[PDB]
Amino acid sequence: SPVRVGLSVDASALGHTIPPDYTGLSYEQAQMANPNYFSGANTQLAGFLRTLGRQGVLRIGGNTSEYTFWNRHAKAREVITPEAVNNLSEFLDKTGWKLIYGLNLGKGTPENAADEAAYVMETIGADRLLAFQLGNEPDLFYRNGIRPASYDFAAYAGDWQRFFTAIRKRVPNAPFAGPDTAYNTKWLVPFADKFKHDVKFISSHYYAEGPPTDPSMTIERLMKPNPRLLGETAGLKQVEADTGLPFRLTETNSCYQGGKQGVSDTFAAALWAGDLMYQQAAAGSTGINFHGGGYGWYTPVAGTPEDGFIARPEYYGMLLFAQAGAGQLLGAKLTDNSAAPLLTAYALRGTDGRTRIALFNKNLDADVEVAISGVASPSGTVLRLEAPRADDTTDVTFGGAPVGASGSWSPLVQEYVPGHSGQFVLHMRKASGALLEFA
Numbered sequence: 001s002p003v004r005v006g007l008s009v010d011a012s013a014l015g016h017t018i019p020p021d022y023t024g025l026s027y028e029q030a031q032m033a034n035p036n037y038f039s040g041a042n043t044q045l046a047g048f049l050r051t052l053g054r055q056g057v058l059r060i061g062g063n064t065s066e067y068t069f070w071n072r073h074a075k076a077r078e079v080i081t082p083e084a085v086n087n088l089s090e091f092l093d094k095t096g097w098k099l100i101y102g103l104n105l106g107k108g109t110p111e112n113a114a115d116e117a118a119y120v121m122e123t124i125g126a127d128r129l130l131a132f133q134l135g136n137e138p139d140l141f142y143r144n145g146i147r148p149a150s151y152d153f154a155a156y157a158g159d160w161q162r163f164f165t166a167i168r169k170r171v172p173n174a175p176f177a178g179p180d181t182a183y184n185t186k187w188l189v190p191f192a193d194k195f196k197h198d199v200k201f202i203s204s205h206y207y208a209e210g211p212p213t214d215p216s217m218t219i220e221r222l223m224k225p226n227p228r229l230l231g232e233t234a235g236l237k238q239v240e241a242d243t244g245l246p247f248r249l250t251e252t253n254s255c256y257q258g259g260k261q262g263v264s265d266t267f268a269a270a271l272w273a274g275d276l277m278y279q280q281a282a283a284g285s286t287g288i289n290f291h292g293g294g295y296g297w298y299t300p301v302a303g304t305p306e307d308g309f310i311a312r313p314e315y316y317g318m319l320l321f322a323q324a325g326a327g328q329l330l331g332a333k334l335t336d337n338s339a340a341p342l343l344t345a346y347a348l349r350g351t352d353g354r355t356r357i358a359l360f361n362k363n364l365d366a367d368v369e370v371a372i373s374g375v376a377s378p379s380g381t382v383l384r385l386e387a388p389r390a391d392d393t394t395d396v397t398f399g400g401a402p403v404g405a406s407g408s409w410s411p412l413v414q415e416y417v418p419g420h421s422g423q424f425v426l427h428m429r430k431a432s433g434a435l436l437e438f439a
């Protein structure tokens, strides 16, 4: 008893071109305390990244960049050694991903940041290094006394400039991004205005979960539009118009403080994440970096070098995006969809010339039947993003297969989308996703 909706693809309604390095992950700087983590020896993790994209960005930063200290002299407080940086360069070579690297503006010195930046540029080098960032979420330094309550944008601008100047003496070509926090008017907007000639792009953060006074995030709420996201995105677009700076979402996940068990670690997070990737690409974002590491509730990839790594449910939403590939987004308008309002759809003219459609039936209790118009093709296939329940922590498949070890994945189920009268009809179960590819 599906809700029968229409989807109209318009090849003449041109949207943004998705860049090849749109995908990405965000990790804590403290991972850099174990040189076995981002290492050429970590073949498992490298394979999970390659499956997420042949190009992409690894962002390292997070709150642990308050208390992680580069020590050129070395072989809560964590230490980054030359060997760790050495090994990170090899990991970037194995993955093909670029790097956003956090420096310690919260507790470190400008001179040590210059020295760390110099060694990163010495060993990772300008091609692989996309940006340094000078502190993570500086607007929240006060929450744990990294700064006093009085710390404001002026104070941070003074810190930022001291660090930037010191770094640029050691590393004249050092690239920067900032301010590495969620859009706001008291920090991000003035950062862009003041430092637009000194940064390459704006780095923003986004957690679907709002302030902790909100009702605890639920799967139901995660599937719904987030008006705050829409507003912040519009703010970032206005910043880009005013300053020329593009924006990248350098730390995001469903819920903050490590994720919420029964939301962040579930199949719903795959639907959320995959949809968010497209939503933000359609809005003009240059890319995304889903935060994770360890066995946190929200991590895309869980595990350790000693015990092995696995793909968590959210990974599978990122995998759908990866399998779709890059290209130019096209108009894709839904109709007759008020009874299935959480279905989203995105159409893409792939770089290879083929039309694809990514659909996320985020309606938890409505199946849909989608009548697709605007595509002329002799053959459409679908790969489904599936789990038996929206809150499942396992049992997630894409294309009829789980992801295996080291990011291994290939589709095992072939399904054609029936075509007639120049249209296609696709059924989707409640709480499912689909990637269509047209011949």
Ligand SMILES: *[C@@H]1[C@H](O)[C@@H](O)[C@H](O[C@H]2O[C@H](COS(=O)(=O)O)[C@@H](O)[C@H](O)[C@H]2NC(C)=O)[C@@H](C(=O)O)[C@H]1O
Pocket: 028, 061, 062, 063, 064, 136, 137, 251, 255, 256, 257, 258, 259, 291, 292, 293, 294, 296
């Ligand atoms: C973005 C932050 O930059 C990121 O560090 C943070 O996630 C980490 O910190 C959380 C809070 O810990 S504490 O209060 O600073 O000690 C912690 O709950 C998360 O587990 C931790 N994440 C990882 C992968 O280690 C996140 C967040 O989840 O809150 C964002 O604030």
